[PDB]
Amino acid sequence: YDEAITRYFASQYVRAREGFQASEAENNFRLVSLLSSPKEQNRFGKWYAGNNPESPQNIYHNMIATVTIKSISFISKDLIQVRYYKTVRDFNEKENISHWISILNFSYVNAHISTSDRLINPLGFQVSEYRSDPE
Amino acid sequence: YDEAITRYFASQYVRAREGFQASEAENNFRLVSLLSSPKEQNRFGKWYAGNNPESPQNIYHNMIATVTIKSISFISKDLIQVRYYKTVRDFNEKENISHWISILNFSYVNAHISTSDRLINPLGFQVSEYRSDPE
């Protein structure tokens, strides 16, 4: 497929995985899950679990964390680098900005997707490996 | 382009235009604007304006309005029908569900889109005419 559409989905994936807002948690969780390989769905879920203090649910509890994409680059046929910053805002007036870099192992799979799951993952974008580190 | 990607964007457009949540207003407004022809951007803006009591800002002030897509159908090469329901929830515990049908006149345009506007409208999806009516 096009590079623009792959960038489109890599951006989305990183925003949904690394951002957080209570109102959008169920949608973001489901978006990330649908764009993840079964093995990756599982790591993501253990990480997002409410009992993990490093879950976005917890570290951004009562906060809003927005991801701004800086750049997206292909290191390889199936390897994307996404540089971004998180802007985090509390119940008060206080912004902390921090910079991060994510690596996605990805591909597209012709599989079965229900008519409605295709309104989220129309092309079978699948992230098989993922990592986020600060800069 | 694919039907799945066109459905993908028609769904998105209708969710962003007909839904409402304060936290996501700026993003939704910008998404709808970017996927609209200049003439349609303008009608949408006069409609969304804070002084219009029929703006989503006002009719769903302090509420959350979520769009669930029922179906998407092509009536023609450039004419989509999107049937959906709005579920509206107040500060209390009270849900009103209502059913609606939207008509989109659409196309794709090879134009200039900045690298970052392409993380929202990667393919130049443009809605030239639009209307939403109850069922």
Residues whose CB falls within 8 Å of the CB of residue B83, separated by 6 or more in sequence, listed in order: B69, B70, B71, B72, B73, B99, B100, B101, B102, B135
CA end-to-end span of chain A? 30
Query: Could you tell me the CATH number of the domain that includes residue B3?
Result: 3.10.450.230
**Interface touch A118/B23, C-beta < 8 Å:** no
3-state secondary structure of B37: coil
Helix (H, G, I), strand (E, B) or coil at A69: strand
E strand or H helix that includes residue B83? strand B79-89
Contact (Cβ atoms closer than 8 angstroms) between residue B35 and residue B127: yes
Map tokens 């022809």 to a residue: B37
Hey, of B63, B73, B118, B121, which one would you mutate to test binding to chain A, going by the most A CBs within 10 A of its CB? B118
Per DSSP, helices labelled H in A19-126 are 25-34, 38-48, 56-59
Q: How many domains does chain B have?
A: 1
Experimental approach taken? X-ray
CB contact under 8 A, B116 and A24: no
Neighbours of B78 (CB within 10 A): 13
User: In which domain, by residue range, is A75 found?
Assistant: 1-135
Which of B6, B23, B66, B120 is best to mutate for the A interface (most A CBs within 10 A)? B23
Both tokens assigned to B50:
């804070």
Resolution value, angstrom units? 2.5
SS3 B36: strand
Check: CB of residue B67 under 8 Å from CB of residue B84.
yes
Kindly determine whether residue B7 and residue A69, on different chains, have CB atoms separated by under 8 Å: no
CA atoms within 13 A on the CB side of A66: 9
Q: How far is CA A89 from CA A17, A61, A67, A95, B27, in A?
A: 17, 11, 12, 5, 17
* CA nearest to B79, candidates B17, B10, B5, B27: B10
